Design a protein around this ligand. Structure first.
Ligand SMILES: [Cl-]
Ligand SMILES: [Zn+2]
Ligand SMILES: [Zn+2]
Ligand SMILES: [Zn+2]
Lengths: 163, 163, 162, 163, 162, 163
């Protein structure tokens, strides 16, 4: 069973207690940034707001999935209302469409929409060129392994980089 | 490999040329309505518009999927901007969120929002109850089998009713 | 005095207490759906929310018109933001415009927008053709008597059918 | 046959060729303001833009009704997206809801939304006090005759001031 | 230090307690109309709602700026979602953009968009003709002094009038 | 004469011909990103589309300003339609509000909404604390000099950092 949840869960990891991410930012669940501010207290304050209860830095399985969903919806929404993204998104198959959401989920709609070239190659279904072009990005550099898997997906149209 | 496409492919079928649906309405692709008007001519016009070329009632696989993606985006956009529907949707797991999308794709966001008790039940994770409450709708009557599979999906949160 | 209220009042009926509609769905006022769920308790819940008091399934005249207005506003709003509908709507006379609102009130914007052909005929003012075309739909089948009247209004642009 | 059209037609009048209104502003059809600028050539430019053809300052009946409708839609749109107006609008009867529209048609949503007290009284069906309170506005002063009729409509709930 | 606040502060004045404006309308802060209704009690209502506390018709500086900012946001939003205005607004320099905002803050987006010619002349940077043309309006007539300064901002592109 | 324009012009620079920005991304005007794609041809493509003419990688003063205006409006739009940001934005004075827009123009609304603590401190007018707090972010790190001036503005409520 593979989807955007199972995909991202292993790209962003799933944690049930507040942790500092690659950039020391307070995070929880599946790559959910709580706050940029270096205050554990502010993180719990934000998390309490997000979950709607006194969590004291610890949430449940179902709660992190709920947070993940809110994030994903924001990403899908980002795609559906960016004129550079939607048309590309609409031309992809289910499996590849998830690799686009994964990108947007990671770096925001504006970030992903900047890949002017890769985006056209993808729309024209020229995967191999799209793979090497994306491999030439700051994205690929700051997070090589994840980018590999996403790019592999784009190139194969299968879940092989995750199975 | 399961997802909303493979799911809806077997609930709406996949057709490469215009046919009349269960209600004599000109359709193509994956349950894509072209027009309520009883004129094969107006249907090709709509289809010509949608695909962006002279199709003469015949389309390709990619074109059908592209058309499907546009319909799904409309269904997800229906769920996200529906106060009644988003909270429920966000509380569901991957597989079970597919079931909800399926329901909207079939009957529109308003229709689905109409299931007051069933929605709350799902949001509280009382699957069994939701199943029996959903099996009591005009929806279940008019399309018993489809609802069975979708309800089986809500109840087990798995792709069993399709795989 | 004829208008969309009096028009829809007699196409959808006006009932001061909850009732199961043509499809076993709990309803009140002027064809106002409360809930698809088979539980009169849920119906009274939604109704309490909407009306803003403890109704126990019974509302007043004014309360039903308030519930009617909210529904209509949603039909008009659905037309005014439907790229296919608004141009047609804007090309109709006061009376015939209501007949369009009527249809949307009955099946929604995406429903009415489906009648591609008839729509263009109406905006072109070829009434009689629009009549026969609409008379060939699942809409005309499921609810013959009403469609007849609505279509009649499109054809004559008057309140004769009512 | 009475409605918002026939009502505004006799308060705003119906003209087939550009005319200066009460304030020396270029107008046409049913109170359709074309421009504030004192340029007949500027007026004819907007009209050519609005009608979609070379009108040379002259339109048809249907072209004025189409223009009228778009102005009505703008007013109804104004009401339904005004937190202060929609709840009062929803509380009126078909006939009185027309009166409200007439006001918004004449002075916009912000103008009408200003009559704080008269609006409450209307939402509380205290018609006769709303009449006197509206009879005390700059609106009633600048345009006495029209206000009377509209205010009469608000007070009786009938088309008497126009029948 | 010049900007839209310092500008509008001196065109609409800043008051910390309800006052009747030029047309006898209850107002506060920076030209913030409270109610057209002739009731001091109705105005204290709106204000209390606007600020979120029992003000009894008296607010603070910060409460008048907060109320000013929301007024300015509504103006900028009106401009950014009006097809006639945004292209003109996006063609102006920082200073001349304040002047447009001002106008919309005073008379709303509809009123400002009614200046067909003066709007095109602005987009075309033909300032002087925009000046003489805006001076012929009811706007200028009803509020001469404020109009002078604003138009002057359109003609020089500097804060000289302020 | 100071304002968001004169402020951002000296932070983002003003160039009339496409250049690679700090990260090797094709840019023009005032920090306007054309494309993440490593293609000068792609950059000229986007540029042609935005400006709407045959630019060959060169624009006028006015075209830059127009471009800048659009970017600023997007940033302000972002703030205004963000529940975390608008209420803080509405609490600031004209001078400090420009600093917020500056941050949003640089890193987008989401990134700026991330500073949970700093934001609230600005809403409570504890400028000095917001200053130190903000100087502890990745933002201050990657772009020290710019952050200095923007944070100075937040602290003094004056244009001193730019005069
Ligand atoms: Cl079935
Ligand atoms: Zn949306
Ligand atoms: Zn709307
Ligand atoms: Zn907006």
């Amino acid at each position: 069973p593979m989807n955007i949840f199972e995909m991202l869960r292993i790209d962003e990891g799933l944690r049930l207690k507040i942790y500092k991410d690659t950039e020391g930012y307070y995070t929880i669940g599946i790559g959910h940034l709580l706050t940029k501010s270096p205050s554990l207290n502010a993180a719990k304050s934000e998390l309490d707001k997000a979950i709607g209860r006194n969590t004291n830095g610890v949430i449940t399985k179902d709660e992190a999935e709920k947070l993940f969903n809110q994030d994903v919806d924001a990403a899908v929404h980002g795609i559906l209302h960016n004129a550079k993204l939607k048309p590309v998104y609409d031309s992809l198959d289910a499996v590849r469409r998830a690799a686009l959401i994964n990108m947007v989920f990671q770096m925001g709609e504006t970030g992903v929409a900047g890949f002017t070239n890769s985006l056209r190659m993808l729309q024209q279904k020229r995967w191999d060129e799209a793979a090497v072009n994306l491999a030439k990005s700051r994205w690929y550099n700051q997070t090589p392994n994840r980018a590999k898997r996403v790019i592999t997906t784009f190139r194969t149209g299968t879940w092989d980089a995750y199975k």
